[PDB]
């Protein structure tokens, strides 16, 4: 009996059995004191004969497929200090007789199929330390009051269960409890004030419930408190200033609640705060200067609130800041230059605010910044030339501001830049040919600007998926170079001064799902090649130009087209070439010179009558029976 995995007692009989990761299967010495069969891929029920070893202090069945209920006689072993049934399929209620185990220290039921309530008998276990039952979706009911009687409790977690109701005031009694995890559950009601009575509490995870009332002030008296995750609940009221009295607290998440009030000035006292998340609340006030005393702060997410004022200039005092999101507030003044002294900033989102003045150039001196999102503010000035200094810029959105002048040619310095949106501004001049040097640029939106001059195919990086130049002053002709953007998908040139023929090389853009040429000076006949992208699916808008001739025959090949608008042109002839397009959803042929009959299909009887009326000869016909 010297076999590996077996331990004999000093009186010679078998004491311990140990097996792990042996890839077994199926179902599964009255002195044996510890039994571990774990990672064995066993199935079926726990044999009710498990009670036949009356000497067991430890039963570890964890990480198998084992099924059925938990044999109640497993609770007839009163020397058991450890029970791990976790990571199995066991179903059933938790037996009341569990209270009969005086010596149970660690109890692990988690990641099972279990259901029912938690027996009120857990309070009979006076030496219980870790209770982890979470990851049972049907384990439910209120948390029993008697839970306050487990005096030595250290870890409680019920996370990802159906557990509901209010945490009982009983929790005042666990004076050694370090971690309470009940998260993504059915909990409701207010956090009980009496939780301020757990002195040893370190981490509180109540996130993703519906928890009402307000955050109890008494949480400030928790001297050892470290992590607070309250996010996605109903929490109302002001953030308690007493949280500043919790020295070890490096993490606070109140995101997505109803809170009101000011971000507390006492937060300055918090020397260890790495992450502060308040997003989606009703919080008001200015950002307090004392929060800049927060040296270890990496993430500050204050977005989606009522915060007012100017961004504090002392923000330079936080040298470890990575992510700063203030979007959807009411913030005034300049983006302070001194924000560029946070050398570790990866991401800034100041979008949806009132910020004014120019964008300080020093921000583009940030070497690790992949995201600058300033969209929707009152921003004015030029885009600094220093924009090429920003090596890692990936996502850039300046849209919805007043920024003036030309787009600096340095932006072609940026080799990682995937996404730029400068739409809805005052920008002028030509689009700088230097942008052709953005190797990575897939999405470019310049729409609603004052841009002018002549487009060029040599001006565009070949990797572009998406281009919107609409609503500008752009003139002359669409270049044949357009045939070189083979990955292009949406292309919108609408509302410009563009003219001439449509170049036939558009047919060599093989990826195109959307083409909007609407409202320009284009003329000539719509080329035969336009029907040659089988890819055109989403939309084709040729409206409001000078096009003449007949709708081209190859058009019947656009079998995936769902929207076509040819309105306000000089086009003539019939629509017969359009009568086989079954996926055609929206068609605007109005204000043209078309004539001839349309079938009585439910499609064409949907076309407005004024639509047909703006043409030369259009009318619905009736087929000869």
């Amino acid at each position: 009996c010297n076999w590996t995995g077996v331990k004999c007692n000093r009186r010679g009989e078998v004491s311990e059995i140990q097996l792990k990761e042996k890839q077994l299967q199926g179902s599964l010495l009255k002195s044996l004191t510890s039994l571990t069969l774990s990672s064995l891929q066993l199935t079926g029920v726990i044999p009710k004969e498990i009670g036949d070893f009356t000497e067991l202090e430890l039963l570890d069945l964890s990480d198998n497929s084992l099924s059925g209920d938990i044999p109640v006689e497993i609770f007839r072993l009163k020397k058991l200090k450890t029970l791990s049934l976790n990571t199995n399929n066991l179903e059933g209620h938790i037996p009341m007789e569990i209270g009969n185990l005086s010596g149970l220290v660690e109890l692990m039921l988690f990641d099972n199929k279990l259901s029912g309530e938690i027996p009120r008998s857990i309070g009979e276990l006076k030496n219980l330390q870790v209770l982890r039952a979470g990851g049972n979706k049907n384990l439910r009911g209120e948390l029993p009051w008697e839970i306050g009687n487990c005096e030595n409790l250290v870890m409680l977690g019920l996370a990802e269960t159906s557990l509901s109701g209010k945490l009982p005031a009983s929790i005042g009694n666990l004076k050694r409890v370090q971690t309470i995890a009940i998260y993504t559950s059915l909990l409701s009601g207010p956090i009980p004030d009496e939780i301020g009575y757990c002195t040893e509490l370190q981490n509180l995870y109540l996130y993703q419930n519906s928890i009402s009332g307000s955050i109890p002030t008494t949480i400030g008296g928790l001297k050892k408190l470290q992590s607070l995750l309250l996010w996605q609940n109903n929490l109302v009221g002001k953030i308690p200033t007493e949280l500043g009295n919790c020295p070890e607290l490096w993490l606070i998440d109140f995101s997505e609640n109803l809170l009101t009030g000011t971000i507390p000035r006492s937060f300055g006292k918090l020397e260890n705060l790495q992450e502060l998340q308040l997003s989606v609340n009703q919080i008001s006030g200015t950002i307090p200067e004392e929060l800049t005393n927060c040296t270890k702060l990496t993430h500050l997410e204050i977005d989606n609130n009522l915060i007012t004022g100017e961004i504090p200039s002392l923000m330079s005092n936080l040298r470890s800041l990575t992510m700063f999101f203030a979007w959807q507030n009411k913030l005034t003044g300049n983006i302070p230059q001194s924000l560029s002294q946070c050398r570790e900033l990866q991401a800034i989102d100041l979008s949806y605010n009132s910020l004014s003045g120019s964008i300080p150039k020093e921000i583009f001196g940030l070497r690790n910044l992949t995201k600058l999102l300033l969209l929707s503010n009152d921003l004015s000035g030029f885009i600094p030339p220093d924009i090429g200094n920003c090596t890692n810029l990936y996502r850039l959105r300046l849209n919805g501001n007043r920024l003036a002048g030309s787009i600096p040619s340095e932006i072609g310095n940026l080799k990682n830049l995937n996404f730029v949106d400068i739409s809805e501004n005052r920008l002028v001049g030509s689009i700088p040919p230097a942008i052709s040097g953005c190797e990575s640029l897939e999405f470019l939106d310049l729409h609603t600007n004052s841009l002018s001059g002549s487009l060029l195919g040599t001006t565009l990086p070949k990797s572009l998926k998406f281009i919107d130049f609409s609503d500008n002053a752009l003139s002359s002709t669409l270049p044949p170079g357009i045939g070189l953007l083979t990955e292009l998908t949406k292309l919108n040139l609408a509302k410009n001064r563009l003219s001439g023929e449509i170049p036939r090389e558009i047919s060599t853009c093989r990826s195109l799902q959307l083409l909007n040429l609407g409202e320009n000076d284009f003329s000539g006949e719509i080329p035969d090649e336009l029907g040659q992208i089988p890819s055109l699916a989403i939309s084709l808008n040729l409206s409001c130009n000078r096009f003449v001739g007949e709708i081209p025959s190859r058009f019947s090949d656009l079998k995936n087209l769902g929207v076509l608008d040819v309105s306000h042109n000089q086009l003539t002839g019939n629509l017969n070439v359009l009568t086989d397009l079954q996926n055609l959803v929206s068609l605007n042929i109005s204000y043209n010179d078309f004539s001839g009959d349309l079938p009585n299909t439910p499609f064409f009887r949907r076309l407005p009558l004024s639509d047909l009326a703006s043409n030369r000869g259009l009318y619905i016909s009736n087929a000869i029976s």
């Binding site: 990802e160 995870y205 996130y207 995750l229 999101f325 995201k371």
Partner: peptide, 13 residues
């Protein structure tokens, strides 16, 4: 498993 504790996932425009 049931997932380890986490912060609300951050959102930007």
């Amino acid at each position: 498993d049931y997932p380890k504790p986490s912060t609300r996932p951050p959102r930007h425009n």
